[PDB]
């Protein structure tokens, strides 16, 4: 039994187009899409006011399609999981830094996380890399002054994600900019033929953060969407795929994977455990993480017994199924941290 998973590069607020194109796939091949994964520049602007948070050049200060979906005028026909890129309503994603549905059928993975679906474990790393900002905390609530920095990937995700392949493998990992160096691991000449501008960066092209995470977790697949081209490469056991932007034929591809089980979208248990155990570093809602704490030090405290109780409590308060919630995003931010804190404090440490 096989599951077909649509994989998409940059959406740029072309949601209706994306869906029509996925619809054409099912009509043209007779296959069913199990779900969709998108690697960024989602531009999930709820209303005109959010334009303030979209860092783009003036000619691209456009609302796009998302608000139709946010309003219920359109309805996404496939469960769509995504990470943030560099063109985002960054305020919305910060409210949802711990993940959340931006609307029915569209689930944001957060700054980073692992989820479960159909027997798969899927890791996500949002943003693009700029060294000047990799140790910057998030400040909350969102401020228009933060438009330039919110979408830069922080170094700390490396510590949050690095233990996630201890108990089983990672099937797919998602990022926006490419893992640094991976450009060298495919037919780069053929690529430079089409993207001569990529050539100056040499092996340094891409995110050192994503390089480390890939070298550490070694997922079956790593999927990325920043570059506006298709590209394939292999780094040991990992299949790298890059995808272009909606409107071009190299934007959408498909993974045909064994389906061992059909199972609703779920929080990953190891991820939940990391999330709870790192709470002390995230305890200040106005500014996090507090890196006077050591993330890996906090995660070193994980135990079999402790993990079990954590999952038990998560199941009690939040549930393992990731379910649609229509409260406003600022309400969700407070609600998810409330329970993370409550769980942590129930552990007694």
Least Å distance, CB 201 to Ni ion, is 15
Footprint of Ni ion on this chain (CB under 5 A)? 41, 85-86, 226
Least Å distance, CB 183 to Ni ion, is 16
Chain centroid to Cα 123, Å, comes to 7
Least Å distance, CB 39 to Ni ion, is 9
State which residue, 43 or 278, has the beta carbon closest to Ni ion: 43
Least Å distance, CB 87 to Ni ion, is 6
Least Å distance, CB 43 to Ni ion, is 10
State which residue, 86 or 332, has the beta carbon closest to Ni ion: 86
State which residue, 85 or 289, has the beta carbon closest to Ni ion: 85
State which residue, 65 or 88, has the beta carbon closest to Ni ion: 88
State which residue, 30 or 57, has the beta carbon closest to Ni ion: 57
Least Å distance, CB 203 to Ni ion, is 20
Least Å distance, CB 222 to Ni ion, is 16
State which residue, 88 or 270, has the beta carbon closest to Ni ion: 88
State which residue, 12 or 269, has the beta carbon closest to Ni ion: 12
């Amino acid at each position: 039994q096989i599951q077909h998973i649509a994989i998409v590069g940059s959406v740029h607020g072309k949601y209706r187009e994306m869906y029509r194109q996925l619809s054409e796939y099912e009509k043209s091949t007779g296959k069913e899409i199990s779900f969709v994964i998108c690697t960024g520049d989602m531009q999930t602007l709820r209303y005109e006011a959010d334009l303030v948070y979209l860092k783009v050049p003036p000619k691209y200060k456009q609302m796009g399609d998302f608000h139709l979906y946010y309003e219920g005028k359109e309805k996404a026909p496939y469960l769509t999981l995504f990470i943030g890129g560099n063109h985002e309503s960054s305020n919305v994603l910060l409210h949802l830094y711990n993940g959340g549905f931006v609307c029915f059928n569209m689930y944001y993975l957060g700054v980073c996380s692992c989820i479960n679906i159909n027997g798969l474990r899927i890791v996500g790393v949002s943003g693009i890399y700029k060294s000047f900002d990799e140790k910057k905390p998030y400040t909350y609530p969102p401020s228009p002054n933060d438009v330039v920095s919110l979408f830069h990937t922080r170094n700390y995700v490396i510590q949050m994600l690095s233990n996630l392949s201890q108990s089983s493998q990672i099937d797919i990992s998602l990022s926006h900019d490419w893992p640094q160096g991976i450009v060298m691991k495919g037919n780069y000449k053929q690529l430079y033929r089409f993207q001569p501008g990529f050539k100056k960066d040499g092996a340094s092209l891409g995110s050192p953060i994503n390089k480390v995470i890939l070298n550490t977790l070694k997922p079956k697949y790593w999927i990325s969407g920043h570059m506006h081209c298709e590209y394939h490469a292999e780094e040991g056991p990992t299949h790298f795929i890059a995808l272009g932007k909606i409107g071009y034929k190299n934007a959408i591809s498909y993974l045909d994977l064994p389906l061992k089980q059909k199972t609703d979208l779920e929080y990953d248990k190891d991820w939940v455990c990391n999330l709870i155990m790192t709470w002390p570093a995230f305890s200040n809602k106005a500014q996090f993480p507090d890196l006077s704490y050591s993330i890996s030090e906090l995660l070193s405290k994980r135990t079999k017994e402790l993990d079990k109780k954590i999952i038990e409590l998560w199941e009690k308060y939040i549930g393992l199924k990731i379910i649609y919630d229509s409260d406003t995003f600022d309400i969700q931010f407070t609600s998810r941290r409330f329970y993370i804190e409550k769980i942590y404090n129930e552990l007694n440490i």
